[PDB]
Structure 1
Amino acid sequence: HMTPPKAEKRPYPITTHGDTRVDDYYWLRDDERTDPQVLDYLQAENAFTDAALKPQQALRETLYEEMVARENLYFQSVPYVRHGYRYQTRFEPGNEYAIYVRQPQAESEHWDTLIDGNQRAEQREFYTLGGLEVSPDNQKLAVAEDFLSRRQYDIRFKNLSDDSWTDEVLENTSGSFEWANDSATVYYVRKHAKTLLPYQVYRHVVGTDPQLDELIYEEQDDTFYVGLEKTTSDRFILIHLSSTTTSEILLLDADRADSTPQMFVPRRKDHEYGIDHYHQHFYIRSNKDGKNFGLYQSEQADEAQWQTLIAPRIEVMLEGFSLFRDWLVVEERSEGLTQLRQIHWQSGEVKRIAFDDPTYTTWLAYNPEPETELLRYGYSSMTTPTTLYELNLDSDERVMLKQQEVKNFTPENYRSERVWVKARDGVEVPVSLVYRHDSFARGTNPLMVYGYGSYGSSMDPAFSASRLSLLDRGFVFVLAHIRGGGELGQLWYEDGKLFKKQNTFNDFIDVTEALIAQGYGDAKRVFAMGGSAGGLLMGAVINQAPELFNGIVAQVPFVDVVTTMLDESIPLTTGEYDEWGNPNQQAYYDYILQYSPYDQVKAQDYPHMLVTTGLHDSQVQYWEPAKWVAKLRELKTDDRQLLLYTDMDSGHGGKSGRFKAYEDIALEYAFILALAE
């Protein structure tokens, strides 16, 4: 019925390597965000989406209500102990924000409020708590807060003796800070006042005018993130410098006055390392000798003196480690599973943590004190809501500390499988899927296939409460563990980026085709979703295999890839040459252009699609999805649904916006369910 919005065409030629591309919608980019013609097109598309989805209002309400009905209003964190105090985080129904409390470890009865987010948010438009830490002497609270929504954190200090605040604010910080052992000095990271990248380390004396703060270090390469850490031993504060490929650490003596940074290992392209310090040794996770990382012990910085504890292995990715009195614990990936292993410092005894589930994830949880035999670790599966366990590393006694509460949920109603798909190049691609048993009939259920596939980020199999709204309406829900992700380690990542990026899209198509061929779902009712770099996935797969999918949800999608990667004025671009490549080089221009979804839109039939973006914030800038929809409307030959939904909100809510997050999920799921009917 209704005529969709038609963006004005303004042919804008871009010539690179002699190749002229004509962009009719280049003008939808307005960095100042005030062009009235640009806002008219976004608003027009919002009105069209509103109009087209109006019949789905009742379904959106039903979905919203059933999603919120699974969740407990009252949430209390698992208490932890640090420096002789016990800490809990509390959410009350009709409180917008968490309250952070504590008590002395030997106390049971009384809890003291550290910070009430509801009191801090009073008379403000926006509030996000970026982080919180009491000083070693238990007397001062440091907090990083954003009142403006720009992810620029103010750091302030509270005297816990009388609940008074000090007079100073540390402004435009990353929220990264560490206490010196004097409980009087803090190190913090300042963002660049233009690019907002973290780039300077300052030393501040609490109570004092920040004009007196000393500049400790400035990073000259803005592809390197600047973070601060504190070692398990408390002996060093670390300046942690890292790009996508390359690390460097500098050490600050946490005990002595006037510390200056001490080099650990000077940066070297493609050497990624991270350190800790404990038991008078440095512990180093490093890829110096293999892409899957090894763990080393050293007395000194000198890389030539690093002793091998765990050699890099082709079959096992080393992700991280924690240090305890008697045990090393590592988190690893092997054969498409996450795993924890513990190794005794003295006996060399190795233990593996056993589970029994085809599609689960396990990880090291928060372990702030090393002088303990108790390990806290997380678990989640497609069928088992997220759980925190405490394991005695000596006795193997495993105790549940907390389970995610899911109302109106019977876990035995659902089944999950791990499936391996031989891809078109013969590489085995893992898949994790879950469905409701009593509505499953082979070849008849709609599929929802979810992928990401960039940055070596893994779409680890884990429990989703909102997902039950699809499973309880007959959907088979699929995680496709495609190349460019991290599920099979660093080589799985490298075989899905740069001159291998097309493998991500091929793997998504190959998994989808296999699951249809094998009878997991209805060939006519296959749906897909991905966001950001997963939106690039959605955009490439519908250009390449438009007939495979009934309908698509592309969130904040990265689709204008060649044009964006040619322009260093766009945020992310300078830091993403080691992901997609640098199209200033003809080899990368050609390789990227081949999949760049905006460039490869053709006059062909597409699936139904809902596309989302945001005006006021961005990771992908709002214009890429708007230009993409404009071009799809111009060229596509089908009469299927194409909708753009642009978030106009001037900012966020409680840590993201929970009400809003469920409203967004309900709108997307109603769109998909209406197509599946």
Structure 2
Amino acid sequence: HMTPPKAEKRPYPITTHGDTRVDDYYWLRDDERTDPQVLDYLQAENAFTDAALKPQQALRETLYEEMVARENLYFQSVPYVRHGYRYQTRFEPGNEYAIYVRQPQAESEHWDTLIDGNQRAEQREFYTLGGLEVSPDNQKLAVAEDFLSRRQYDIRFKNLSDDSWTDEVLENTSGSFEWANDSATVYYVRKHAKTLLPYQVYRHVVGTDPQLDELIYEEQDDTFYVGLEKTTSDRFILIHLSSTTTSEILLLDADRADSTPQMFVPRRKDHEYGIDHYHQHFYIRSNKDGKNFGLYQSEQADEAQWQTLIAPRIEVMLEGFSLFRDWLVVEERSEGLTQLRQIHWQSGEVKRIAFDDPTYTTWLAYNPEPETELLRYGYSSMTTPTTLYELNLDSDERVMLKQQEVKNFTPENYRSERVWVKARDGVEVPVSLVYRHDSFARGTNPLMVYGYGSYGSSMDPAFSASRLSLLDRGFVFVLAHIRGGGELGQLWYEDGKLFKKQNTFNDFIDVTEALIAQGYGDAKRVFAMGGSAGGLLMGAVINQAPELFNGIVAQVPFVDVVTTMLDESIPLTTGEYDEWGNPNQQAYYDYILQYSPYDQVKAQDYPHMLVTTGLHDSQVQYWEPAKWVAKLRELKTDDRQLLLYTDMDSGHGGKSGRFKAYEDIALEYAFILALAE
């Protein structure tokens, strides 16, 4: 039926390594966001998407309604105790924002309001709370708020004795701050006024003019993120400096005045470490001796005196650790499973936390007090809604503290499996899938295959309430744990980045082909979805294996890879040479160009596709998906659906942000379910 929008072609040559690429849609990039022709193309595409998807309005209403109907009792958090006060977060129906309350630990009956986001948001266009922490003496509240939607945080201070606010505001911060043990001095991170990268640590005295703040540290390499931490012992504030590959920590005495940063271990390329301090020792998670990390104990900074607690192991990735009175607890990955292990400081007794599920995730939860035998940990699986457990590290007593509530849901209606796929290079790739039992018939069900596959980020198997909208309409939902993710540890990541990035796309295709061959789904009704670096996945896979998928959802997709990675004026580019490579080197130009989806669009049949972008935010700049759709409309030889949906909003936040998230999922799922009919 309808004629889609046709972006004007303005041939723009880019020559690198003597190779000229002609980009007809280079002009859709407008950093200033004013070009009226660029806006007219984005708006034209939105109007086309609106028109093409109009008949799906009734289904979108049905999905949105059943998705919101799964949630509510609006929400109260599990209380935690920190420094003799109990804290709870409360969401009431008819409140856009959380209210944070507290009470003395020995009190039951009465709760004091700490901060009411609904009150803070009054007469504002936007509100995001980026951090909250009461001073050690329980008298002052530090808050990091964004009222402007640019992820620049204002820090303010409330006197809890009379609910008065101090006069000063700390502006353009990362929201990262720590209290000195005097409850009078805070350290915070200032962002660069141009790049907005966190780069400076300041000391502030609460109540005083931020003009008087002292510059403590400034980072020279803006590939290194500046964060603040405080040790379990409260003895040190840490300046944590880190790039994607390299760390450095500086220590600030949290007890004494006029502290200056004390070097821990000087930065060394490909040495990532993090520290804590407790029981008069430094504890260090470090890859100095192996990619899967080890845990060390030290009395001093000197790397040479670091004692091995847990050696790096090829078969086990060490992700993190928590320190308690009698126990070390570590979070690890082995054989495609997350695992928790505890080791007694005195006896060396080792215990594993046991589960019984093929496709779950477990993690260390919030544990703000170390003088306890009670560990809080999280659990989720494809069939079991997210749960918070409390485990007695000594007795092994395991108690549920909170379960995600899911209305209209019977868990025994669903089944899940772990599947291992031998990839084309003979490497075993894990897969996690779930489906509704009573509608399952081998070879007949639509498949939805979800992947990410970058940065060592894992698509860990966990519960989704929205996913029930597909499962209850006969879909088999698949997580493909492809290389470039972290499911099999650091080497799984490294075997899907830089000169191995093609393994990410190959693994996704290999998993999909295997599941169809094995009878998990209908070969004619295979769908896929991914976002951001998962959108790069979508883009590469449809160029390489266009007949495999019926339909695709590509969210905010990274697709103009070579052109973006040649231009440091784009946010992210200078931080992403250690992910994709630096195409200013011919070896990386050639390797990336081979999969760069925008470059590799060809005159061939593609699947149906819905593409999303956002004008006023980004992460991937809005122009990449818009150029990509323009080029696909020019070249593709099929008559299938191709739609671009651009988020025009000034921004979101609070329950209306959750409203928007459900609307978007309902629009994407209606698109897919319409194709599966």
Band the TM-score falls in, shorter-chain normalisation: over 0.9
Give yes or no for contact 2:96–2:656 (8 Å, CA) kept in 1. no
Report SS of the residue matched to 1:512: helix
**Within 2, Cα distance between the matches of 1:386 and 1:475?**
21
CA offsets, 1:283-317, max 9 Å, x none? 00000000000000000000000000000000000
Give yes or no for contact 2:181–2:255 (8 Å, CA) kept in 1. yes
CA offsets, 1:402-450, max 9 Å, x none? 0000000000000000000000000000000000000000000000000
Report SS of the residue matched to 2:655: coil
**Within 1, Cα distance between the matches of 2:462 and 2:216?**
42
CA offsets, 1:468-496, max 9 Å, x none? 00000000000000000000000000000
**Within 2, Cα distance between the matches of 1:69 and 1:112?**
31
**Within 2, Cα distance between the matches of 1:36 and 1:662?**
31
Residue 655 of structure 1: CA displacement?
7.5
Give yes or no for contact 1:129–1:655 (8 Å, CA) kept in 2. no
**Within 2, Cα distance between the matches of 1:166 and 1:41?**
48
**Within 2, Cα distance between the matches of 1:294 and 1:549?**
42
Give yes or no for contact 2:332–2:338 (8 Å, CA) kept in 1. yes
**Within 2, Cα distance between the matches of 1:655 and 1:673?**
26
The aligned counterpart of 2:379 is 379
Residue 520 of structure 1: CA displacement?
0.1
**Within 2, Cα distance between the matches of 1:472 and 1:222?**
47
Residue 656 of structure 1: CA displacement?
7.9
**Within 1, Cα distance between the matches of 2:225 and 2:674?**
44
**Within 2, Cα distance between the matches of 1:323 and 1:522?**
49
Give yes or no for contact 1:128–1:655 (8 Å, CA) kept in 2. no
**Within 2, Cα distance between the matches of 1:494 and 1:653?**
36
Residue 676 of structure 1: CA displacement?
0.1
Unpaired runs of at least 5, structure 1: none
Report SS of the residue matched to 1:511: helix
Residue 654 of structure 1: CA displacement?
1.0
The aligned counterpart of 1:18 is 18
CA offsets, 1:43-102, max 9 Å, x none? 000000000000000000000000000001420000000000000000000000000000
CA offsets, 1:588-633, max 9 Å, x none? 0000000000000000000000000000001000000000000000
**Within 1, Cα distance between the matches of 2:577 and 2:597?**
18
**Within 1, Cα distance between the matches of 2:71 and 2:629?**
35
**Within 2, Cα distance between the matches of 1:179 and 1:99?**
23
**Within 2, Cα distance between the matches of 1:329 and 1:464?**
27
Residue 653 of structure 1: CA displacement?
1.6
CA offsets, 1:8-42, max 9 Å, x none? 00000000000000000000000000000000000
Output the TM-score relative to the length of structure 1: 1.00
Report SS of the residue matched to 1:655: helix
Q: What pairs with 1:61-100 in structure 2 (closer than 5 Å)?
A: 61-100=61-100
**Within 1, Cα distance between the matches of 2:350 and 2:453?**
33
**Within 1, Cα distance between the matches of 2:403 and 2:618?**
34
Report SS of the residue matched to 1:540: helix
Aligned residue pair count: 677
Query: CA 1:472 to 1:334, structure 2 compared with 1: closer, same or farther past 3 Å?
Result: same
Query: CA 1:655 to 1:347, structure 2 compared with 1: closer, same or farther past 3 Å?
Result: farther
Output the TM-score relative to the length of structure 2: 1.00
Give yes or no for contact 2:96–2:655 (8 Å, CA) kept in 1. no
Residue 579 of structure 1: CA displacement?
0.1
**Within 2, Cα distance between the matches of 1:606 and 1:518?**
24
**Within 1, Cα distance between the matches of 2:50 and 2:301?**
60
CA offsets, 1:489-530, max 9 Å, x none? 000000000000000000000000000000000000000000
Report SS of the residue matched to 1:357: coil
Residue 652 of structure 1: CA displacement?
1.4
Give yes or no for contact 1:200–1:226 (8 Å, CA) kept in 2. yes
CA offsets, 1:311-368, max 9 Å, x none? 0000000000000000000000000000000000000000000000000000000000
**Within 2, Cα distance between the matches of 1:350 and 1:42?**
58
Query: CA 1:656 to 1:458, structure 2 compared with 1: closer, same or farther past 3 Å?
Result: farther
Give yes or no for contact 1:197–1:222 (8 Å, CA) kept in 2. yes
**Within 1, Cα distance between the matches of 2:656 and 2:380?**
22
Report SS of the residue matched to 1:144: strand
CA offsets, 1:161-212, max 9 Å, x none? 0000000000000000000000000000000000000000000000000000
Q: How many percent of aligned residue pairs carry the same amino acid?
A: 100
**Within 1, Cα distance between the matches of 2:655 and 2:286?**
33
**Within 2, Cα distance between the matches of 1:167 and 1:73?**
38
The aligned counterpart of 2:359 is 359
Give yes or no for contact 1:453–1:484 (8 Å, CA) kept in 2. yes
Unpaired runs of at least 5, structure 2: none
Report SS of the residue matched to 2:44: helix
CA offsets, 1:532-566, max 9 Å, x none? 00000000000000000000000000000000000
Most deviating of 70-79 and 15-24: 70-79
CA offsets, 1:112-140, max 9 Å, x none? 00000000000000000001000000000
